[PDB]
Amino acid sequence: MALSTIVSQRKQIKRKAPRGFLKRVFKRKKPQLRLEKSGDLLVHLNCLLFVHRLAEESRTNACASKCRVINKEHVLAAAKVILKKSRG
Amino acid sequence: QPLSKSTRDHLQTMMESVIMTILSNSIKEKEEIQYHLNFLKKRLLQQCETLKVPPKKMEDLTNVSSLLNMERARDKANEEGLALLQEE
Amino acid sequence: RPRQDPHKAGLSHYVKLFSFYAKMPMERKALEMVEKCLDKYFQHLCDDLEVFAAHAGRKTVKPEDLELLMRRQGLVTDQVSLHVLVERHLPLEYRQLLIPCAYSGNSVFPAQ
Amino acid sequence: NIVLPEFEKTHLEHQQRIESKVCKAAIATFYVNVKEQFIKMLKESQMLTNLKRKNAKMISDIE
Amino acid sequence: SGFRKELVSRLLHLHFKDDKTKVSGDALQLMVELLKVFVVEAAVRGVRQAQAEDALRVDVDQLEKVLPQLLLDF
């Protein structure tokens, strides 16, 4: 397999969430606010749902645009709608 | 042999549309005039149901003008081609 | 002698989750794209949480703000609440902390 | 072609019942509207069939 | 040549979850102008799509080409 192409992961990594990374990001972005006890878990869940939406959209865009391998324009066009739908 | 229900639903949506547009300008005596309109519309539907007519055939009404234009273009093209061939 | 910044180390988890959910071979040029989209999404999420907390009248972020945001996103509704999504997508160690449960003489944890 | 006359006189089957001004105006307006629609759609149908058969004959002639 | 107050008042009251929730005057004033901005935006989007085609008139097709992203924005 070429280094440019990555095969799909047959096994999923452990479902442990990087709570420290999310806390550090939320602190460096908005340091004036304070997150609650387990808000990072809800942020992780929202990120999981966003990634799932983006993945399915990129998959259908790549399979509908005469392609067996996900390219850059496919995920680009998927993000251009997913990012707009994810805000409210 | 009664007609097919395609022209029936076409007529019913056309009559709903014309009732709606004539009601758009109506200001006084709102509810009873539209009540009478739907009553007489259902009565005309019944009268069309009881009527009999020899069978005929055509397609949906949304593609009338487009098909007419395509047939006009094809007629002109065939005419000019036949004229050229005959002159030769 | 490898060197990895915490940002890429944090984003690699979601990148691998995306690669697993795609179920299709993906070019390497899409990884940085997914990372940039994740950064933009995190920025917009932080801004939305900030404005929601400001409108709520308090300085701290509470789970009702995230519930309102997910409801505006179309993910959470009155029938399909947040507990259903937590049970569907999260393991037991997080469900024990998020969803309240009673045991041992009506002892409820967390207090809800 | 045969359904059109009958429906036509249904016009005067309504005039004998309703008597209000604006109701009568709406009746006349929407009735002439649906009549125009009937005539135009049937004329378009006839012209479409004739044009189709003429196109078939003409392509046969050129071939 | 715009929306009326009673129109949108009925529209919002008949679609609410409970009639106990009331609408103030400034909110009702902003609602009609928001609806007007939305409809004029839809119209100008459709006509700009038609100009991208430079067709003869605006019909259902140019509308539905831009229709989804409009409500995706709103």
Place this chain on the structure above:
Amino acid sequence: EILINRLFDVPHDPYVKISDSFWPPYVELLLRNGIALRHPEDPTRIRLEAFHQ
């Protein structure tokens, strides 16, 4: 007892709609301990796990 009765009497439709009497603590306990299962289409209906099968 209600869940067991619904499972044993109606074999092909053992789902029960969640009521106000079923407060979230006990329902969550039963769902976490694997005793009960939500309906795949609507979480408002729950059933008992078929242990004998």
Place this chain on the structure above:
Amino acid sequence: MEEEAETEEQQRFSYQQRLKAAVHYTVGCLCEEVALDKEMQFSKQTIAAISELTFRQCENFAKDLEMFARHAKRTTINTEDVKLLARRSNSLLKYITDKSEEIAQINLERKAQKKKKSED
């Protein structure tokens, strides 16, 4: 009992039809005043479609407004909920905020006139 319920349902349906006709007249006026000075012509099907879609979107607007009002423990809707509802795209957000500034200076004018009348 069912007959009276069905008559009330039909009365609500006639009310909805009147609202549809009114909003259709309004959107027709708007579209036919923008089309002429935007050098293009419109078809009636597009007018009907925009009418129906505006009617359907008003319900979503009402839902979002009631949600925003409930989130702040307020049974009445104010300008803050209408400003939050427009936060999806910043362009119309700024448009609505400057419109609220206009409403605010109008309220200032009304308050000044009321104080002047009370002075007399």
Place this chain on the structure above:
Amino acid sequence: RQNLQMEIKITTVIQHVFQNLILGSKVNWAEDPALKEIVLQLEKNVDMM
């Protein structure tokens, strides 16, 4: 025979329900022998009695 089958099924269901309840209640059963006998007799089969 049908009564035997029904009793076996009911007993299996009750056994599994009791086991899951004792597990989820988060109680120490080894200290109380009266419950220890039950939790030791729960797992064994019913038809081979």
Place this chain on the structure above:
DNA sequence: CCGTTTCCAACGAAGGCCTCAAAGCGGTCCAAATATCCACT
């Protein structure tokens, strides 16, 4: 007696499956930072 609609014979490519060879590296074993964490004070 002759033109037209229709079923039948036939070439084809078309797709679907099978096989082999070549370039790649993921997986397994292994180093020594180093970073997650749990409570240290």
Place this chain on the structure above:
DNA sequence: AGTGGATATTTGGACCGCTTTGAGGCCTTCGTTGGAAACGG
């Protein structure tokens, strides 16, 4: 919560058979096309 000490983690090093892609063959089966024949004037 700043300070701390410890132990599992992993990423770059190294190597072989599993891995997929590209190409060639070849087959069994539907379809478009030409034509003989029955029907209408």
